[PDB]
Structure formats: C-alpha cells, structure tokens
Design an enzyme around this catalytic site. Structure first.
Site, PDB file in Angstrom:
ATOM      1  N   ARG D  60      43.592 -23.288  70.346  1.00 45.38           N
ATOM      2  CA  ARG D  60      42.451 -22.454  70.703  1.00 45.38           C
ATOM      3  C   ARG D  60      41.344 -23.318  71.295  1.00 45.38           C
ATOM      4  NH1 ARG D  60      37.895 -20.995  67.440  1.00 45.38           N
ATOM      5  NH2 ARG D  60      36.729 -19.228  68.326  1.00 45.38           N
ATOM      6  N   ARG D 107      19.953 -13.708  72.197  1.00 45.08           N
ATOM      7  CA  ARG D 107      19.332 -14.861  71.567  1.00 45.08           C
ATOM      8  C   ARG D 107      17.817 -14.736  71.623  1.00 45.08           C
ATOM      9  NH1 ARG D 107      22.324 -19.157  70.033  1.00 45.08           N
ATOM     10  NH2 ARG D 107      24.539 -19.117  70.631  1.00 45.08           N
ATOM     11  N   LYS D 254      38.939  -9.424  70.666  1.00 44.02           N
ATOM     12  CA  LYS D 254      38.241  -9.760  69.433  1.00 44.02           C
ATOM     13  C   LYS D 254      37.390  -8.572  69.005  1.00 44.02           C
ATOM     14  CE  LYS D 254      36.374 -13.885  69.301  1.00 44.02           C
ATOM     15  NZ  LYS D 254      35.434 -14.938  69.791  1.00 44.02           N
ATOM     16  N   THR D 312      38.908 -16.847  60.749  1.00 47.40           N
ATOM     17  CA  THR D 312      37.630 -17.254  60.159  1.00 47.40           C
ATOM     18  C   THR D 312      37.721 -17.633  58.685  1.00 47.40           C
ATOM     19  OG1 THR D 312      36.323 -15.937  61.721  1.00 47.40           O
ATOM     20  CG2 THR D 312      35.253 -16.638  59.672  1.00 47.40           C
TER      21      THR D 312
HETATM   22  K   LIG Z   1      32.555 -18.410  68.320  1.00 45.32           K
END
Ligand SMILES: [K+]
Ligand SMILES: Cc1nc2c(s1)c1cnn(Cc3ccc(O)cc3)c(=O)c1n2C
Ligand SMILES: O=P(O)(O)OC[C@H]1O[C@](O)(COP(=O)(O)O)[C@@H](O)[C@@H]1O
Ligand SMILES: O=P(O)(O)OC[C@H]1O[C@](O)(COP(=O)(O)O)[C@@H](O)[C@@H]1O
Ligand SMILES: O=P(O)(O)OC[C@H]1O[C@](O)(COP(=O)(O)O)[C@@H](O)[C@@H]1O
Ligand SMILES: O=P(O)(O)OC[C@H]1O[C@](O)(COP(=O)(O)O)[C@@H](O)[C@@H]1O
Ligand SMILES: [K+]
Ligand SMILES: [Mn+2]
Ligand SMILES: [Mn+2]
Ligand SMILES: [Mn+2]
Ligand SMILES: [Mn+2]
Lengths: 446, 509, 468, 515
Positions: D60, D107, D254, D312
C-alpha cells in the site's frame, strides 16, 4: 402490531433475518439500542479507582463488579478498598428505585522462560515445562479467609488446572464461605485441556487471556476464548472475558479500533461479563474505560442473532421436570414473541433469574430480590438487572408478590427500561420460599 | 415409543430412516374425524358405536333428503351424544355440520357415441328432447363460460365432451370419453368461470333450517370468491353469527382465489371429489398440500375430504392406497379427515371410523415435529396480543417438560385454537361452559373439549380453579393424565373472553 | 414459472407447500419408472406396444401363476413389442424384464374342502387377509393364499421351484429378479447362488413382505441391489395402519444408501374396473414419488384389469406432477450431508454436475456410461434435471430404469476412429434424442458428464453446454 | 482433527464453538491476503524481501504524504524486491501495488508551532470568509470548505484534529456558524476537520487526487483505494480520472463516513470492492458503532462476491512492541471470521519497529481463524443466496467448489485471463486453495484481493496446439503446488478450464489425481 418505528430500533430487522449472512447484511448503525446493558462490567480496583468519589462515578458509569487483585497489596490495603467501594455503593441506597447493587470479587494471587508479560524469551512464565506448585498457596488460604471475613461475593481462582484445584479453594472458604461463587480462571494449556471437569465443579469461568496468551501461542487465544464461552453458554454458567480489552485507554482517552471490536466480539461470542484491569487499576481514564465498555456492549447485545442462538440453546439443553426451568424457557419464548421490554422475576437465591438468563432473551431480566448478596451475585449472569427490595412483608403474600412486581415496574420506568404501553413478562411462584417458581404472566405497563 | 427417535433426528432423511413400526403411539388422536350421516348411520345404536370409535363431527349432506329427514338425523345424533351426559368427566362433545347442496348444474337411457357429435342447448323447449345428439342444461350461461376447446364433464366426470363450435343453437361438442347419460345428472365445467349465484335459494332455506336447529358448522359448497362466503354468512343471519363457516374449494377458481377466500372463512375443506373433476386428477394433491400448508400458516382449520377409505363401503379392510392417503393427509397437516359413503351408506361405517382413528394416531407420531414447530414459530408474526404470547409460551413450556397436556380455559375456543396452531405434542384439554364452542373446537387439531356444567361459584378465582380441576379429573379418567405428570395450565386475569394471559406449570396429584 | 420452481426456491418446507401451483406445468421427462405386471390384459404384442408408448419401463413377470412356456410367450411378446421401435434409434425406449419369484407361499372352523373345513398345502389369514380364523371373517373362494403373521415358519429361503424359475430367468436373459419374502441376508445370497456365474449381472431387488424383513432391513439392503416395499403381503403381516411407516422408513434408507426402491400394490386398484382412479389412489402415487421412490408398480391394474394402458398413463401423469413438487433444496442438502466423502472421481464429478444443474436449471445431465454406474451416482443425488444416459450396453440401458431420473438411450454405431470424436457423437446422439422426445430445446443448458479415457470407471469431467 | 474439522462438521454453531481445539494445527494455506503500508520501516529492498517471505501480498502506497519521486522510489524497491524471486517461476509470488489516495480534505487555517486552546463550554465561530484565513484564535476557526455553513444544521457537530476537538453549532448566522465547544483541546495549524453525519459537498476527487491518479496509471499500479467515497458518482469520478489507459486498474472504495455507510449499496454496485476504513469511520460515527458497519459491509460484499478489506490499528501496539495485545489478536481473528478478504497493516509496517513480525503475526492469526470458520453454514448460505444463473463460468464455479468439498480436494486449479474465473470460485469460500494460472502479470497481482486465490504467473510462450498450451499451464499449476506444499502425490485436485481461447468461456471441471 408492533409499531413501524419500534421495529427499526434494537437491530430488530437484522433480528428477523432467516440466515446469518442476512443478519450481518441488515445490521444498521442508525438502529439505536435500549438503555438496558446486559453484559456486566468488572473493574479492577487500584490507585486510579480507590477513592470514594472516583468509585461513585464508576458506579454511575456502569461498574457492576469490583475486582480486588490480591497479587499486590496487604490485607489492610484491600480492607480499605472494600470499605471505600461499600461506602460509594451505599451512598445511593437512600433512593431504592435507582440503587445499583455492586458485587465485590477477590482475585487470588495463585501460583506466581518468559518475563514481563512474556516480552523477553530465554512476572515469569514457564510454558509447557510442567512445574510443581500446588493448587492453593499458604498465602492464598489466608487471602480466602480474608474474603469470608470481609464478606466478598465472588472468588476469581487463579491458575485452575483441575477439578481438585477448585475443591481446595472451596475448602479454604469453609462452611461460612459456602455461599461465595467460585469463578475458575483458565490461564494455561492444562486448564484448557481439563476444562470440562473444571467447569463442572465451578460456578463459572474467566478466560484469563493475559497468562493464557503467554502460556500458549498468541494466535490461539481466540480459539480458547470462543471454545470456553460456548461451553459455559451450553452449560448455562457465567463466563468472563478479561485482559487488555481497552488497554490503550490506560494512557489515551479513546481506544483503538481493535479494542472496541474486541469488546463487541466478546459480547457477540456470548460472554456474560467483560473486564478491565489496568484500564481502571492504574490508568488515567478509569471512568471513560467503564463508559466505553458500557456503550459497546449495548450495541453488540442488540447485534446478537438471537433467532439462531435461542434455537440452539433450546435444542442443546436437556429436558427438565423442574418448574422453574420450564417456566423460564416459556417466559423467554413469550418475551421473543412480543419483544417484551422486560422479564420481571422474583427470586431469593437468584436461580430463577439465572435460568431465564441462560436462554439469552433479548428482553432485560429485572430481578427483584430481598437478598442483598443475591442482588450482588446475579451480575454474573448476562441480562439480569438486580433490584434490592427493602420493605417488610405484606400481610397477604399475594399482595407482597404484587408490590415487588410493581417495585420492579417503577424502577424500570425510572431507569428507562420500561415505558407505558410496553409488554412485560412476569415470572413468580405459587407460594413463598425458594424453589417454587412456576407462573408466567403477560402484563401491559400502566 | 411414539417415534421419539425419529422426531429428534437432525434431518428429515434420518427422521424417515428412524420411523419404527414397533414404536407404539401413546398420545391421544388429535386429527378429528368427520362422518357423513346416511342410511348406514342414522341408527342411535350405530351412532353410539361411532362416537366410541372416534367420530367428532357429524356431517349432514343436504345434497339429498328433506328437512324432516335431516331433523331426524339431528335428533338421533343428539340422542346418542347426550346418552353419555350422565358422566360429565367422560362426555364427548360432537359437532354437527351442515353441508350445503350448492349450485348444481343438471342435464335434461341414451348412449353417448364416443367420437360422435352432441350439442348442448339452452332453449327451454329442448328441456325434454334429450337424446344421442341433444343434451339440455338448466344453466343458461354455459354457452358463455366454456369457449371452443373447453370441456364439459357429465356424471362424476366419466363422460366428457369438447366444444368445437359456438353458435345460436348452443355449444357444438364432440364426445371425448364414452358412456350413457341418465336423467338430470351432474355436470362440471372445468376451468371455466362459473358465475352461478354464490347461494341457491334451496341453500338459503337449508341455512335457515341449520340456524333453527342449532348446527355448529356450515360446509359451504363451491366457494369461488370472498363474496360467496359473505353470501353464506348473510343467509345465516346474525342469529347464526356463532356458526363456523368452512369453505369448500371445489373448482379451479376457488383454488386460484384461495387466499381471498381463506381470509373471510373460518377454515377450508379440500373437496377432492368435485375438485378432481374440475381440474386434472393428477393435480389434486398439489392443491391439497397447498391449501393445508396455507391454513397451517394462517392457524385456521383445514379438512381433507372424499374417498379416503372408499373401498370400505363394500369391504371390511381398506386398500394400501387409502391407508397411505389418510396417513399422508395427517402428515400434510390436516386438522380433520372425513368419511362420506363409508359412513353414509356403506356396510362398515363403524370400522371405517376405527380405521381413520387408528391411522391418524400412527401418522401424528410420524410427523417431523422438530422442523414443523420451528417453521410455524418463525412464520407466525410478532404479536402484542396476550393470548398469542401466552399460547407460544405454553407450547414451549410443554415441550421442555414433555407435558402430558395443556389445560386451557376458554369461552369461545380461541385460546385453545391459538395453542393448536403451533402443533404441540401435548394434548390441548379445553374446558368451556359453551356447549357450542365445545363442539366447534373439534375443527382444530389436538384440542380435546370438555363441557363444564356446574353453575358459577361466588368467588371468581374459585370458579377458575374448579374448572382447572375439572380438566384434571377428566384428563385422569380418560387416560391423558397420571399422578407425577407435569401439565401446562393457561388461564386469564379477569372474566370474559379475550383476557387469557397466564401460564402455569403444575404437577398432577 | 413452470416445474413448481417458485416452490423449489422456498426457504422452508411450509412455504414450499404454500407455493405449489396447479397451473405450474411440469417437464415432459418422467423420472419415476413404472413397473407393469404382465397378464391376460397386457400380453398381446399390440397391447404391449401401447403400454410402452404410455410409459411402461419395466415388465414384471409374476411367477406365482403360469408355466415356464407361458412366461416365455410373455417374454417373447415383450421383446417383439420393444424391438418394433428399434428402427428409429433416436426414440427407442429400452424396456427391462423383471422376474418376480413365487417365494414361500401357503395356499388352500376346521383347517386340515368346502365352506366349513378348509384344506391347506402346508403343515390365520386367507383371501389376501380378508378372513380371520384363530385356533372375524367374510366370504371365501377356491384356491386362496394364507398368511400367518407371528409364529415362526419352517419354509426355506429358496424353494426347489423357485430355483428352477431363477435358472429359467438366466436362460432367457431377464434383467431383474424380484425376490419374494426376503427375511435375511442369507435369502439374497441364495438367490445370487441359484442365478450362478452366468447370472451375476442380474439385479436382485429384495421384496420386504413381513415383519422380519422390516426388522432385518439393513442387512437385507446391504447385500441387495434394491428394495421393493411389497405392501400387499406386508399389509397382512403387520397392522394395516403401520404400512406407511414401513414404506417411508425403507424409502428413506434406500435413498440414503443410494440403492433403488420400489413402491408396489393397489396404487391404482380401482382402475381394475373403472377408467378413473379414486382421490386416495392418485394421492398414494404422488406421495410415493414425494417419499423418494425410484419406481412405482401396477399389478392387477395391468395384469387383469380392463384399463391397463390408462393405468400406465395415470401413473405417468401423476409422477410428473409429483416429481416437480419434490423439495429438492432440502433433499439435496441432506443427501450431500449424509453421503460420506469420496475419492472416487465418478462420484465427485456426479455431485458437482448435480449442483451445477441446479444452478442453471439445466434441462438435462447427459452422461456416457457402460455399466450404468456413472448414471446411478448422478441419480443418487436426486437432481431435478433429467439424467440422459447414453450407453452401448443393451443390458445397462434396461437395468438403469431402476434408478430415479435416468433416461437410457441405446447407442448402436461402431466406434469412431478418434475416441474424442466417438465421445462427441454419443453426446450429440443424446442431444438429438432429447430434442425429438421433448426433453431439450434450443437455448437450454445441459451438463455433460464423461471421462478422460475409454473404458468404465474413469468418469471425471463435467462440461456446461448450451443447446443449438 | 487438523483444520478444526470436528468444529466445522458440527450440527450447530454453538457446538462448533465448543469443539474449537487449540491443539488442532492448520494445514491449509493462508487465504486472507495481507496489505502492508510502505514507509520508512519498509522501504529498503532487503526489508521488503523479508516481508514478501513473511506473507505480504499487497503493498500500500499512502499518497496522503510523500512526493511523486518518493512513491516512485517505493515502487522501484518493491518491484526490485518482488522480481528478485522471478528466476524461480515455480515459487514466484506476485505482489500487488495499491495506491491509497489522499482524498478530499477539510482543514483549518494557519494561526510554525503557534497553538491555541479551545476551552470547553466556550463560544467559537467557524467562518470561511477569505479575510479570516489567517485570523485564528480561541474563539474563531477558519476552514477551507465554504459549504460547511450549509451542511451542518444547528445542534449538529464539527470535529477538529482527528476528532480531538468537538463543536456544536448553536446558530447559523451571516458571519458563519456560532458553536459551543463540547470537547476542548489544543488546536494547531492546518488540522483535519470532520463533519459527522453531514452530506459533504466536496467533489469525488481533489485536484491532487487527479495528479496522483495519473502517476498511478503511468507507473502501472494495480489497485486504487479511493478515499472518502460517499456515493456512486464519487467512484465514477475516480474511474474517469484513470481514463481508458487505467481501465484495468481495480477500484476499492474506502467507506469512511455516515453517508458512505448509508449509501453502501449504490457504491458497491459500481466498485470492484470495499475498504472498511475504520480509522476515519471511528471519527465520523461513534466508535462503539464501527463493528456494526464492519460486519454489515463484509456481509454485503460476501453476498455480492466482491473483495472487502478491513483496515486500521489491527496490530497497533506492535508499532513499539514485539507482541500484540489480546484485543488486537482477537480483532484480526474476528475480521477473518466476519469474512474479510484482506486485512491491513498501516503504521505497523510503515513506521513501526517490528514490520516483519507484524506481517508474520497477521499471517499466523489468519491461518487459525480461517480453519475456525463454521464452513458448513457459511457455504450453505452463500449457495442459497447466490441466484440462479445461465453463465457457464458461474455454473462451473459452483460445480467445482461442490466437487472440491466432496473429495477434500487439495486445490482448485483454474486457468484465467482476467481473474474472473478465480473470483467466481472464491465467492463460495471453498476450503481448497484456488490456484489461479494466468499469463497477465496484472491479473495475477489483482486476484490477491479475492480470498483463497493463489496466483501463479505463467511465462512460457503459446504452444502450437492450444490444447497443449492448456495442459502445460495446468501442469505448471500442479508443479507449483507441489513445490509450495499445496499438493502431494495422491491428492485430488479440481481443474477448471474453458472450451476456447480468450476470457469468458470457462465451462469445464475435471477431477484429477496428482502425480
Ligand atoms: K490516510
Ligand atoms: C448466534 C450466532 N452467531 C453466529 C452464528 S449464529 C453463525 C452462523 N454461521 N456462521 C458462519 C457464517 C455464516 C454466514 C456468514 O455470512 C458468515 C459466517 C457464523 O459465523 C455464525 N456466528 C458468528
Ligand atoms: O429463584 P428462587 O430463589 O428459587 O426464588 C423464587 C421464589 O420467589 C417467589 O416468587 C417469592 O417468594 P418469597 O415471597 O419468599 O420471596 C416464590 O414464589 C418463588 O419460589
Ligand atoms: O379463549 P377465550 O374465548 O378468549 O376465553 C378465555 C377466557 O376464559 C377465562 O379463563 C375465564 O372466562 P370465564 O370465567 O368468563 O368463563 C378468562 O380468564 C379468559 O379471558
Ligand atoms: O459408468 P461407467 O460404466 O463407469 O462408464 C463411464 C465411462 O464412459 C466413458 O465416458 C466413455 O467410455 P467408452 O468410450 O469406453 O464407452 C469413459 O470416459 C468413462 O470411464
Ligand atoms: O477467467 P477469465 O478471465 O474469464 O478467463 C478464462 C479463460 O481462460 C481460458 O483457459 C483461456 O485460455 P487462454 O489463456 O489460452 O486464452 C479459457 O478457456 C477461458 O475462457
Ligand atoms: K354437499
Ligand atoms: Mn493471570
Ligand atoms: Mn360438490
Ligand atoms: Mn407377495
Ligand atoms: Mn481520511
């Protein structure tokens, strides 16, 4: 019947699926669970969770059992812990409808090359290499006597390897300790192989994953955990999942994704209780750890595939001529038919509540008892919510039964377990005294 | 015993391999027996032997006989039945069902030349000119319901004719199967939408008779639509509001509109006689199993009828096919089985009742209970009705203790019926003051009605316990209960029907 | 949809029943083979031709009546009727010949000859269990069969007359023996011994006719090629209300064992005199197919009755409807679970092909076989698709009628020069046969089962083909 | 037994659990592929050789950080490490390269190390006025997503810096959203923002994603992990940016927020597979609900026959410690038992001190978990749920899996051009290894997404007679399996082929004995 909005809560669509695959596919993150959390939480007492005020917050967060780790600390240390737990617990007794009983469990030091949780190869562990130590120490005997003298409810017996290890424990508790529940901790390969004979002489099991993970390969702990949970589920005896469930919360305010998944899957496995060790003994977020386990368990309990679990528990349990068992399975089945908000049961020893809990109803089992010890000890059984009744008997026993049932309804309303219009199953017996439970009634609330 | 190794099996295939001819039935027969009354079965002495042999429902076939004739049948039945009323602990209720004549299309010796040419006319002048190439029918709309290529069966479907042409004279037919036609004999219009009235005028006078004489059940002939059922219920009037209507599915349209019919009926009769003519004979078992399955699903009684032991009209022992047919009907899930000519006119009416009872007991133990109960459980929807909730709790409790019986107190029968639909192995002993409900609950498999006669006690809870003890004492005397046995008792929290909500586990003393 | 496919896809047996549809029409290919007994009503060559066209697959010769010369005439007339269709190979229907043995029989109040004292041929039920005598009755006739259910009997496992009849069957090349009143494994070994080495290829179907046969069923089945549930005598030997228990038990155990089972006697009895059967009789035939029976039988309906061809037509019509009403979903799952794991590539291929056929609702599984074993191992897993078995062996083509759902085609051409070409020609012969007979249409999927090399025992290949 | 076969034979799931045996060692090969994130701890050629041998199947690349030259170096060292085994074709392991996009982001503004404290209970205003781009403090935060003022209603919440700071919108006004600080914390510059439960207006692709996606096409990456996929149109935008030259690249969506979970079905239909991105999911929805989303998504991809990745923190503690926690080892095992096709390592291999041991741990756990699957109920439910089909590849696939179970076949050897025939076998979760022989190097790498598929790269040129070419590749699959321990002499295998060259004509299943 059953409202359309009510049918999309508690993962009820996933509950009515004809296959496990469809059960998974229908799980819904917007499907909110009920307030009643069935899986009990054991919190280890330590520097971070010893003060009376800290213990009050952990009670409100959901702590049901307080674990005294006698691996460390003098009897004077543990006496002060027991005194502080009981002070915080009784601080709520002035309000009977909301009072939460809290059990006190004594975890033995036990028989105490790997060093430091098995971190360096060559606490110290000697895997495979069978060693000599006896079942009960001479300090264990003094610790267990301290347990009887201070009136603990539960004993977590370390490193149980055979049936005789349990009998030695029970002998040390003595005739005055005959009422204490013995949870045998399975901690090594021998305890796993002799599990069937250990379980038959114990009141329950703790999958002690800490030592088990060093004694056997780390890859294999989940196999042992799921085997022991299923075997106690089959046997109708409580099982505890312990160690490192939310380990990172010792220093962090939020757990990892693997940790929340571990709590959830332990609940989905069928564990009666989940445990916190350093997360409440030493860590910086003891109350938050308790809160997190409570929140995950609520979600996971609703995600149990009750349809298949109930059928398999029904088929595996042998036929019975005991009216308490017969009434229990009928009340559980009746509760499934109406999605009853609760099963309200009267019990003195807790057995009637345990026999309902062993068939794993979705409905909360609200257990009204006059026995403060039974109220503490039924936390071992998944889904039992104990209520301590404090009034002297009514003059007509039937009136005394009805008032305890009402006390259960009133406490359920206040805690958010019951609402007007809910259906409830009420389990009683035909005469006072233990052993005569035989009646099941269907009531609407208010 | 009672095929317990076969019922515990993990699969149906192993359940079959474990069926045991040496394992003897011990539970009481749960499938009710319907016996048609006729010349072989009008004797009071014969009716007493038929009661003791197992007759639960007496069927009056109003296709034939006058009102006075059926009044006599009713009187002889009730005399034989009430002859046991002096011992209330053993008295068996016996229901009386009126089976209506229904819409019967009729013709006008003459031989039907196979492969010939015969026309069927509607003109009223041809009602007396019937012969080899003329047939007349009293149904005028026959010319508008059977198109070219459709068929017209005559006399129980043994003479057939196909429509080749349509015209003013009538329908142009050809003979498919041969025979000779008599005087005004049964005609069938297979596949065609027959829009005769849902109720003949004869049917309306007969339904009034049944109300006047207090019949418990109506078997309604040739039910094709929901409005046919409503027509019957209208003719019963609200003086006959408590009479149960069982709809006879007899033709193709009834099978197709079955669900609409079941929703407005109290139950269904698989009338295989007419149905076997109105649709191909090889398809009848499909319709039987479909209807039995969906009545099981709806928790409504279903009757399997016609020729189940036909050879016993003339012979003392049935054929292997007839034995298998009765057994497979029970295995299908039929609540009741029926005898027609075997009890109406045959030479062995009592022996035919005995056979059905004997076959039913063996088949009821051969049921794969494990899968049946699991499937009925999951299929029955969630309910907030306390009688429903108590019933499934009671059936579950009965299985856990292997209860000898489930004693239930009921006013209308509903609480017993809600237990019956889950097919418990334990007997459902129903205690009722309603003599009519005592009889009507025979339609539900596994319910054994007991009529309570004592007047009400002062204390209501005393009266409840007396009735429960009445079911205990009746159960012990009849062989259902023993000391040491466990029983499930179902009661309610207040008087009147609709308040059942209590299940108790009791030991018999 | 047709073939009761909506009911086929139900998740429960209850919904399976609920979805059965009288308007859902079945497939022309009828899986349950029909045995018809030969007698005065079914003996002329012209009548046998009509019964072949009606659907008769096995001709039963009842050796309890008639001489050896009489049964040679019956055999000769059947083979003349069967071979009368051989000139059109794509439609030729093989017909098997089965010899039903007389067996231990006791033929004909004081029993030691009129209507007061009855003589018997052996030192009490008479007239097919219609009269009861005890050391309950009706009307007698002359020459009657006698049943003695209970006290144990001294008649042997194979009589001298039976041995003579079995040797007749070898000499005349019968495919199948129905062995009467089999009580033990030793009774079957006695039949296999009287058949001798020249009769080693004949299939032995053991008839279960009494309580002992039911009791020792497992040992009887293990040494038999199959079972007949002989409900006539069995219905006199045990209580009449218990025969259905014995039938369903035996059909289940044969289905689990993968060995054929026959349901017999009085299935359409009233058609001996009437052109239409009763509602109970059509139910009995349909329920025999639903039980899992490989074959259904007619006796008096074809031997002596006035409607022998109509009786064959009725069983054919019922079997087609009942076969589609089978709950294959649960039956296949339970058969897979109960059958032990195998390293035999023929059985491994068979279960894969059956699974594949269910996935595509294949019109047929086309299999090449010499001994019949590859087709039987397919039949064993009860596919809904027809098992079209192309074989060069005339005997296998006849004997494979015992296995439910196998439709045998006799291939007659000498080998092609490349064996791969000879395989394809036989597959094509099955496709062309299935098209003519109405088993296949353009656009259908079929599963083709063959092996990797010539000779029996090498089946190992499953191919998915679309019909052009 | 071995294989936990007494447990898989059990008649109920309860008894299956009771029969799990810690002394029953696995013998089948590991079927769940392992994704390792490349980073400092795993960028050297010799370390990557160690991780290929330890079991890494997919590498990845995290385009959330690092320059194009950096990731090209990662690709070069991966390919050098992978190709150093190519000289022994019978044992060469294809290793896929996956591109994980940075994705659309929100952000905060730049207030160096200048920090501010957002006090609990305070009043903070969130504005996107370009004049406030630099004027951040303790009661005012700027964000670079102007439509934030329209997608967050009053009472809705705004998370800042991995959810450390929580804001609750009190009123919507002209200046912006006036919020009360629900959870306080220390706020830095350019910290990530999450809008839980909100319908986020961002395009399916950032402009940097477009550039990175072209880099991936030009460097021949096999797989794209598309970030922040919320609807079918997001996947379409990813597909368009890859263009016709990137049409063979696999798109794994995702799922990271509430909308993506709720719109999962439309996303899956246009995706090759799904990643359960539990990291972001656990900020976007309550942490105690993530397992619900994981199990739902794994079940629906299992049902659709499409690969699913769980990711994760699976072995997070191994970043600093040589042994995992009991929770982490249970999390990997339960992801496999859920039905996940792939499991992932992020910081454990990208920057931790034990990258090779983390790959070894996931391999060893997955081997145990795969044998602990209640295979009997899984296959029965997958079978009945898969609809009827007249596609010969589908029909052959279920025939081959059934035959594999009947003989306990050591493997199902399948010839495939695109991998589809291997995927159709994989969807029925056979316990026999699916050994896929292909000439396409990209298909060999991509089929690592499908559980139980073991790809072999065939390198020989086509034989004269096609039937000879087929048998050669089948025997190459057999000889590979023998050398790797899959197949022993006397084993039975299921061989799946087709009737003519080119993909799409699979229609033959053969039962063969080995050697
Ligand atoms: K990420
Ligand atoms: C109370 C219960 N708990 C489970 C059941 S019943 C069950 C049944 N079958 N299986 C295997 C399987 C089947 C289908 C899938 O989609 C995934 C897994 C399970 O894992 C499984 N669990 C965890
Ligand atoms: O669970 P246990 O300990 O057996 O107690 C159940 C008992 O509780 C009761 O409901 C009430 O009994 P008490 O009034 O003595 O508390 C009894 O009817 C029944 O026998
Ligand atoms: O089955 P039904 O018709 O609903 O009646 C059941 C009723 O019978 C009872 O047990 C007693 O009814 P009665 O006393 O009025 O006869 C009630 O408690 C209950 O509601
Ligand atoms: O069912 P059987 O008797 O074993 O025969 C199956 C055989 O038939 C075949 O398909 C063809 O064999 P032949 O060419 O010899 O007839 C073989 O491949 C296979 O071994
Ligand atoms: O799995 P895919 O991509 O559909 O390809 C399967 C194909 O493989 C093949 O074996 C093709 O072989 P080639 O590589 O020689 O083209 C065909 O028989 C079949 O159609
Ligand atoms: K009538
Ligand atoms: Mn320990
Ligand atoms: Mn009629
Ligand atoms: Mn016989
Ligand atoms: Mn992100």
């Amino acid at each position: 019947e059953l409202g359309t909005a009510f049918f999309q809560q508690q993962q009820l669509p996933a509950a009515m699926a004809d296959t496990f695959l469809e059960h998974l596919c229908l799980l819904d993150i917007d499907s909110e669970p009920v307030a009643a959390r069935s899986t009990s939480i054991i919190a280890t007492i330590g520097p971070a969770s010893r003060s009376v005020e800290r213990l009050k917050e952990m009670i409100k967060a959901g702590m049901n059992i307080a674990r005294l780790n006698f691996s460390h600390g003098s009897h004077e240390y543990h006496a002060e812990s027991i005194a502080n737990v009981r002070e915080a617990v009784e601080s709520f007794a002035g309000s009977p409808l909301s009072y939460r009983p809290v059990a006190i469990a004594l975890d033995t030091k036990g028989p105490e090359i790997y060093i430091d949780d098995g971190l360096i190869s060559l606490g110290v562990n000697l895997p495979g290499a069978q060693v000599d130590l006896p079942g009960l120490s001479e300090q264990d005997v003094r610790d267990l006597r301290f347990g009887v003298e201070h009136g603990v409810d539960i004993v977590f017996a370390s490193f149980v390897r055979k049936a005789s290890d349990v009998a030695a424990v029970r002998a040390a508790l003595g005739p005055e300790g005959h009422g204490i529940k013995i949870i045998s901790k399975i901690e090594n390969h021998e305890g796993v192989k002799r599990f069937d004979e250990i379980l038959e002489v114990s009141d329950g099991i703790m999958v002690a994953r800490g030592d088990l993970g060093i004694e056997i390969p780390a890859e294999k702990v989940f196999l042992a955990q799921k085997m022991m949970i299923g075997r106690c589920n089959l046997a109708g005896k409580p099982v505890v999942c312990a160690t490192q469930m939310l380990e990172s919360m010792i220093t962090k305010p939020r757990p990892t994704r693997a940790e929340t998944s571990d709590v959830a899957n332990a609940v989905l496995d069928g564990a009666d209780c989940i445990m916190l060790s350093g997360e409440t003994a030493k860590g910086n977020f003891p109350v938050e750890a308790v809160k997190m386990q409570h929140a995950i368990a609520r979600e996971a309990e609703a995600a149990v595939y009750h349809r298949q679990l109930f059928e398999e528990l029904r088929r595996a349990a042998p036929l019975s001529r005991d009216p308490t068992e017969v009434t229990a399975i009928g009340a559980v089945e009746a509760a499934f038919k109406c999605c009853a908000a609760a099963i309200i049961v009267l019990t003195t020893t807790g057995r009637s509540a345990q026999l309902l809990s062993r068939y794993r109803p979705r409905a909360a089992v609200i257990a009204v008892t006059r026995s403060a010890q039974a109220a503490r000890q039924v936390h071992l059984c998944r889904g039992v919510f104990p209520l301590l009744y404090r009034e002297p008997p009514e003059a007509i026993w039937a009136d005394d039964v009805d008032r305890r049932v009402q006390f259960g309804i009133e406490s359920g309303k206040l805690r958010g377990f019951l609402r007007v219009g809910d259906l409830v199953i009420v389990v009683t017996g035909w005469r006072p005294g233990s052993g005569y439970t035989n009646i099941m009634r269907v009531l609407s609330i208010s």
